[PDB]
Assembly symmetry: D2
Amino acid sequence: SPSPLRIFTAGGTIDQDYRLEENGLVVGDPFVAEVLKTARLAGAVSIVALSRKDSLDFTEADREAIGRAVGQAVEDHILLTHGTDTMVETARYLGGLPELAGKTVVLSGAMVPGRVGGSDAAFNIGFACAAALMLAPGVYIAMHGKVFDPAKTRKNRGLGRFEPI
Amino acid sequence: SMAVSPSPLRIFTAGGTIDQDYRLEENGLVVGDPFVAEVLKTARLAGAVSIVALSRKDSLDFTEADREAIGRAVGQAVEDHILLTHGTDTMVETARYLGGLPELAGKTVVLSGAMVPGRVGGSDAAFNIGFACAAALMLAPGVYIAMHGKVFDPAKTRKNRGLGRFEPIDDQ
Amino acid sequence: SPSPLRIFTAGGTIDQDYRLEENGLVVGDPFVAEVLKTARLAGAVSIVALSRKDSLDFTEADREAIGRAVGQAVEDHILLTHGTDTMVETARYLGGLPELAGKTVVLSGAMVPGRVGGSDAAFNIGFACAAALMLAPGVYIAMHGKVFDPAKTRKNRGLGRFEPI
Amino acid sequence: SMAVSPSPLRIFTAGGTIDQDYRLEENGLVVGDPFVAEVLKTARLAGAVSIVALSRKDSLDFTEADREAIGRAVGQAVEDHILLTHGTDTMVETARYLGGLPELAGKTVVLSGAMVPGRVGGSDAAFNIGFACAAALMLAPGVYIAMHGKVFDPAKTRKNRGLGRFEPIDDQ
Ligand SMILES: [Cl-]
Ligand SMILES: [Cl-]
């Protein structure tokens, strides 16, 4: 085989881990690296860290910086792992950038941290890798085993899911 | 009417390494329950996926009659998006057989599985299930093998039994 | 085989699990039950739920109620899973009760939730079950692969461990 | 002087089910690295435990010379608290052999392992390691089998190979 994939990590629930110092969860090392370590991949992949912030902390300036970072990739297939709180805001922002118009850009993450039992993360990473390879140029959210149009999607905080508007 | 989430994907299971589990009686691994069901249980799916168990035979007892039954089951499915979980040692033989059924011509059929049992630590299984579900939804009609985070053409693929990987057969 | 063991669950980090509604960890179902399900035990065990409170929330009245509950057990071998924040306070309280003087009472738990990767919980449960069977009547803390005297122990919050005073 | 945490327990590993792991080459389980090390890595121990790997032989290739080497290693240890991880099919034979060595008379020696490999989901291994570490520290000198959350007298124990459990031999 497939086209080279570049993966950017912006934090989120997917990456949370337990720390004794905080007596709870903190954004830790990118879980996507753990998943891809055992995926026995054939194709070229590179993983780059952007952020470990809470996605609620992202400003417009942070989304502009994420846009420029995705634009630094020569790869035309991109996965961004991200928190679900503001995944829609980032995805809509990227979808408006003429500079990304040739790329397939998929945002994903997890509702349950990858390091907690019963997580969606590994499935979501496989699904989102396929989506980043196979979908036409555009910006997408891949969650819940489907592909969402960011312009027509919202995060339901109370129900812990993405849904059509 | 209130929105109904479609369920475009059906899954069939034929066993293989992906489903192996330890049994005290055998003092070893046997083909267990379908591991794909465990992965989808926690995937928080928007739709549902019907998972239909076809066979758990050991690779050695898996016959041509068994492959026929798989082709009947895939062709009879209403869904046009199909994932078959299967052993890797004869996945190419099953994929090639399904590619020859004209009844499958409008369906996207993806075969997948795992090199390491899902119930053993460090398994490729969950990644492979996520990737193969997407592939079965997104690829054009045809028969494919989805492994190692890529798509293989069954007519141009072999299994390297030593290394536990699929490899392309290069054109000459 | 061994003498019957009664296990009481009072919550704590050991039992924490991720909930979408809280966007974080909450005290969930007792992890000791998950561990003992696969331990293939020969002996008689019964598990009883007392509390799912944060151990910091326990009052003197709650510790008196825990004492009376342990006293309702005919078993002379007792494990109490508990949060580490006030495990010493509960253990010292129980150690002062003449009514428990014939029982072996062991408190344990985990520094990392059992449902998070890399947890101490399963090891701690095996160790603490053995301790509850094998130690002389008394009240003990079993953590870090050793047995602590509650009267001579403190929880180091900053270092996430129990240590001699 | 500032307090030094003693390390009263030494661990020896002789393989067994507890250590089995999946290998692509064998298309199956082999005796892998010592799983006891994985469990103790995350136990947040106050002391340290030296873990000494003695053997990984398949039960079939495990010989009387191999049992002798285990008795030499346990007797030469400075520690008087010893846990040996081992296969369950011949744990009673090894335990009985060690019980006959006068050099072991002041040591508490516990044998343990797992019915299900540590690297397979749903394994007894971590519980068994915690329980057997405590047992090796708390029991009086002697040789014991610690499994199923209890202590077995090797002279009065058999393995039920069908059920994957140790059972007492009742006195008559
Ligand atoms: Cl938290
Ligand atoms: Cl095997």
